[PDB]
Each structure stands twice: as structure tokens, then as C-alpha cells.
Design an enzyme around this catalytic site. Sequence first.
Site, PDB file in Angstrom:
ATOM      1  CB  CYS A 193      -1.017   0.035   1.328  1.00  0.00           C
ATOM      2  SG  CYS A 193      -1.911  -1.035   2.137  1.00  0.00           S
ATOM      3  CG  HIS A 246      -6.149   0.936  -1.090  1.00  0.00           C
ATOM      4  ND1 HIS A 246      -4.995   1.829  -1.352  1.00  0.00           N
ATOM      5  CD2 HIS A 246      -5.241   0.065  -0.140  1.00  0.00           C
ATOM      6  CE1 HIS A 246      -3.750   1.244  -0.983  1.00  0.00           C
ATOM      7  NE2 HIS A 246      -4.285   0.118  -0.017  1.00  0.00           N
ATOM      8  CB  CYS A 269      -1.520   1.595   7.426  1.00  0.00           C
ATOM      9  SG  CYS A 269      -3.670   1.277   6.884  1.00  0.00           S
ATOM     10  N   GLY A 298       0.291  -3.104   4.273  1.00  0.00           N
ATOM     11  CA  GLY A 298      -0.350  -4.588   4.675  1.00  0.00           C
ATOM     12  C   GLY A 298       0.988  -5.680   5.157  1.00  0.00           C
TER      13      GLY A 298
END
Lengths: 395, 395
Positions: B92, B350, B380, B382
Site C-alpha cells: 500500500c 485504494h 499503512c 499490509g
Amino acid sequence: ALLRGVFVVAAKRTPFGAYGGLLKDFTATDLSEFAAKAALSAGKVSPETVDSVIMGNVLQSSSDAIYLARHVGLRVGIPKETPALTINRLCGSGFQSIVNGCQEICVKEAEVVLCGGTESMSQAPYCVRNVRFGTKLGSDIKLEDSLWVSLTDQHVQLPMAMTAENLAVKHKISREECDKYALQSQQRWKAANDAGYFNDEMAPIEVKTKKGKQTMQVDEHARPQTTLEQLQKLPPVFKKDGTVTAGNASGVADGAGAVIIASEDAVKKHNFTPLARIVGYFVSGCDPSIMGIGPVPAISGALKKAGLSLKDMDLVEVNEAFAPQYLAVERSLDLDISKTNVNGGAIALGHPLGGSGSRITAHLVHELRRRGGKYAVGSACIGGGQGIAVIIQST
Amino acid sequence: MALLRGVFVVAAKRTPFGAYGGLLKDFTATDLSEFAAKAALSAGKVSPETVDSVIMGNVLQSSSDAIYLARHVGLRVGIPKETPALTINRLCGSGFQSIVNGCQEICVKEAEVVLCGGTESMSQAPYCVRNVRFGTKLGSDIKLEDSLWVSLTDQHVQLPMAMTAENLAVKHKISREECDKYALQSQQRWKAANDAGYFNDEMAPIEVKTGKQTMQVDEHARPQTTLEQLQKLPPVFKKDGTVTAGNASGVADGAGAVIIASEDAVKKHNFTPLARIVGYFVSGCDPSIMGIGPVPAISGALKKAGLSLKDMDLVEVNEAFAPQYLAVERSLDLDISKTNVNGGAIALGHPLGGSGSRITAHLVHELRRRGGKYAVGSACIGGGQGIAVIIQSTA
């Protein structure tokens, strides 16, 4: 000229498995874990000291692939606060991880970087595309072989082997010369393996056989009973009267390596044992139709930046993607064969895309020390038309 | 710890974000990155011949040409073949990470001008057939594995991403009601900003099929959303949980491109700088609560830059899940009037590799529109990481 000193404090690599062979059930994550654990152990590097994890991996081949570097870091006991990055510069990825580690150290964002390379080609999936949102009756949907399609550069519509045939034609390399190079790679691999020249770098792996659990510590793809006569009988695979056969191209393979690098400050603080210093590196683009020539500008540029000449190199490694590709590089740079790919290469032990550059680097670190030499350079051509080279200096 | 050389944003663009199976579904991640890059080159009046390095974030390989992505993008937009090309994956955070790698290259003087993009096509995520190259066992349960769905679970902790957000909801005492109100606010802010023109300067419109039309609006947004509609949605992963389809980010397609340059390059090429990169930081965190990544990432970046949160005119924290965002807001005591001011991923989706590029490009333009001085964008990641990048507006 690197802004801070960067030292190799450990270098290991797994045995390389054949396609569908002894390592087929281990993911690229697993193979990278095995190399990294071995490197930590061999360098007596505490995981706690690692500030960054950077892994090269080309073709995502497991359900957990996108998490590869992070999972490797965690599995080998590096703290959860340490970040983790996966990179892809195709065949050069194993060298690139080290280049990114060098950059991080040099701008003081890290002190100690675990830099690896890994590939499981055996696990490359078949992909079914365009079916999420409905299909048309009568359409031609494929179970696409993700590996096979990835070995064609769709920008120029050439299989990688055909970019090597281009170089064979351009540099006047015959089929006979290619087969002789291939034989020599097999012979050199065999001599080195039996002499112990892979012992310091090798990260053995426990595997399953019909005979039960066994320790794998020898490269599976190698064909040590090869003869020139056998090679002469193989048909060209991609081109009528071409140079490239199954016998003189690198094999599809599974494998990984891990190189741990550190700043001077870290070497002192942690009492690491430096094995080599990274002196320089360079990445260059080139014509995608002759991508195999990548090592020519990459080696030249690296040498130039380091203030060194080819004559200063005790060892050169040029990844053996295809015999005619390697030979083109040898001819363009006038490499001395007695100091180039001295212990065999990818024709003998295979080319796991992300892993080869980590193996080459790890081999150079240990073999340079064994010879008492001062400098070595390792390089690889890169599908799509790039090259990379990394120069090391023995400590 | 200042950047070793000044690094300036000279262009920042991003595509409209497409819904899953929506208007951009037939464009590959390569295509989307090409579009954003072409728009950035144009917007910054940067000749492709001036670009020394191409770096692209991409997470899930979703086309047959995927491994070549950055290289193909570079070649398609006219950048010389000598310019090298790297693809990176920090999940991400990839869209921010491409920029971070570009900063490093400029700072160690290996580049002067870098094209740094982020891209994802989640619509094209394939179904994978695994373990059938080398035979099958009669009675085995072979799946057409949904590569996207399986990638949204971190197998190291065996948790769907949404379950890591539930963990934060429990830890930080965040109620379902508070999550739905945050979601509604994201939809409202997206809608107000879009209609006010606040996405105009960043937007890289794309021609699509419907006949041909120009797409310049985010497709995932649900501007008629009400709190009541959100209240009716069932929790998707946890009985009585906080996470629903309405308050998590959507799966989406999109890309961005940020061109950065050294001070020397800005002067030599007469670029007009839009922002300076002041600092960045990447941190690991507990994978079970991966959504908290922006807390140490932002704190660390502020520390390195010698700034405080109070100095930030704008903060962006990627909206992976409402309760994840709210845990970050609480931990850092963010001012909601300066945080995610124009909506986020709950509204516009996203696309894994693209979000960080969009966020950066949005901050560059929105900071200038507000007449502010500093902004920080973060996400953030993953697997348990966070990334943050701080910009300063430049005259």
C-alpha cells in the site's frame, strides 16, 4: 565513490533446483528465508541489528508473494520495526537489492541491510484473465503460462532467446562456439563443486525424496557428463539453424541468495567480520532487441565511476543467460576467459531470475578471498534491455 | 537529518480512479502508469530526454507484461533507452516508496531527474491455477485462486486486512457508529472537493469507452451516501464488528506520476518547482495491527525534518478502513479539519500501488491552493509497515 563505506559481512545462497525438481514445493519466500537464515548464522549477525530488508523477486509465484520481503524478515527474527521492500529489475534483481541497500546506508537511513534475491520458477502459476465480469460465448480464454509469457518482451515481441540470436548474428558467434562455451561452463561448475569452491557460500536445504528426507547441497541443474558430441546433436529451439539450444541456454530454476551489508560504524559497533567492500555499481538501459549486451555499458560505467579498469579486475562474472549472449559480452569487452565465469554459471546451475545476482555476488565474495585477489565485478543482462554491475574489493 | 541535496517536485499528476470492473478495467497497470507519466511530463514541461531514472510502484502483477512495467512505461513515453527502469513493491505504500527511492538516487548523485510513479489495476487481478505443471493427485481440490482476494490476507498472522482493523477498533475503543460517520464524512469531503475543482490540477484525464468519452471524475465515490444506508450494512468479517463494505476502502484501478529533480537540474532546465521533499520515513509495526503504521512513520519523518505535527498544514492518512484511520487520528491527536480534507480511499478507492502517488500529487496541489507551507502524506501497509513523506511548498 560511495558516500560511506559499505561492507559485505555475510553472503550465502541456496543450492539451485531444477524446474519441477527438488525445491519445487518451496515458495520464493521459503527459499529467501533459508538463504537469509544461513547468512545471519554464517556472519554471526544478530537479526536485531538489521535496519532494512530488501529482496529481489521477479515473477510473483505464490499466494503470499506480495508480502515476500516482510515475511522473510519476520521469519528470520528481524524485529517487527524493521521495514521490508521487494524490488524487481528482472534478471538483475539480485544485484539491485544490494544497490538499494547501499543507497540506504549512504544516505544514513540504514546501518545494516539484508539484501536478497529469490525466485521459484517451478511455482509460476497459470493465469486466467478477463473472466471476472462475464465472457462472450465463443471467446478464446487461455490458461496462460505466466512464466512462458514473461520470457517474451512484448515491447519488441521477442522471446529472450531471440534477443540472444540477434547477438549471435551481430557478433558473428557460431553454434559450435556456443556449444564449446556451454561445455566449459559444465566442466568449470563440476571442478569447482568437487574442489569445495561452493562450500562457504552454500546454504543447504532439507528436501524430500522417494528415499526420505535428505540434505540438498549440490546444484541440481548441472549436467557433469555433458560432452560436446551430445551438445552438437541438440536442435536449435527458437530459430532454424540458430545458435540457441536446450543445452547452451540457462535453465529455468529455483533458488535464492542473501547478502548482508553494513556501514563501517555498524561493523565496529557489532564486531562484524567484513568480507568485502562495495566499491561501485552501475545500472544502464540498452536496446531491448539485444538486451543480453546490458553488461557492457554496466561494467564500463561501474569501472569508470570507481576509477578502475577491466585490467584491475581479478574476477569477472557475466550471468550466462544464453551462451551466444555471454560470448557477445566477452567479445565486446575483450574479457579474459581465465578470469571470467571461472566456476561455471547459469548454463550449468540455472537462472532463477531474482536469485542469480545474489548467488553471483556471494560467489565473488568468497572466491575472490580464496584467490587472494583484490577486485571483482559481477553483472547480468536484464530482460527488457538493461544491465547491472557491482564491483567489490576484498578486505 | 536533512536530504543530502535539495529534491523538488516539478510535476505531479494522477489518473481518475476507476471502480472494480468499471471504466478503466481494460487498461493494464502499465497503461495507467503511462497515462499519468505522459500527463506529468507535459505538466512539468519536462523533456523525456532529461529523465535519468524511472521508478514505478506496483503491488499485484495483473497483466502478462507486468514484470516489465517500469521499463515499458519509460519507453512508451519517449524516455531514452539508456535510462534504466525499476519496479518496487512496498504494498500500500508503493506510490510513496517510488518517490523515496528517487530521492535516494538523486541524493547519492546517481540521478538528477527521476520519474516516480505508482499504479494498480485491481480489475485485472488474475485467477491463478497452482500446482498443475508437474501432475495432479486424483481427488485434490484445485482452485481458480482469486489472486486479489488471497493477497488481502496476511498469511504470516492469518488475518484479513479488515480483521487487523477490527483489532485496532477493539484496542482503541472505536465504535461501529464512529466508523460509519467517518465514512460519510469522506464521501461528503470528496464530493465537495470534486465539485469545487480541487482535483483539477492533479487530474490526468483518460479517454474511455461507454461511445468514447473523457473520464475525469473518480468512479468509486458514492455521493448520495447516508448514515442510514451505512448503518444497514452488515459487518463483513466479524460478528458485531466495525468493518463493512461501506466503511472500508474499495478495490480500484488507478495511477499517478511524480517527477522530481535536484536543485541543479531545476536550475539547469529552468523547471518551476511546486514543492520540495523535506523528509520521509518508513517503519515496521505489528502485522496484527498493520493499520497503525502511519503513527511511527509520521512521527519519525517529523523528527528527521525537525518539525512537529503543529507545523503541518495538511495531513493525509490513507483511508484503508475507517476504524484503522480513527486509531491513527487518536494516537497522534490529528486535527480533523486539516486531515484527509478532500476525502480519501473510502470514497475514491485504494488501487494499491497508486494511492501513495495520488496522495502526494493531491498534497502538492492542495497545499499550494491553500497557501500553506508543509504537508505530510502517509499510508499503512499490509504486513505491518507505514510510510510518510513530508513536502514543503516552494515559491
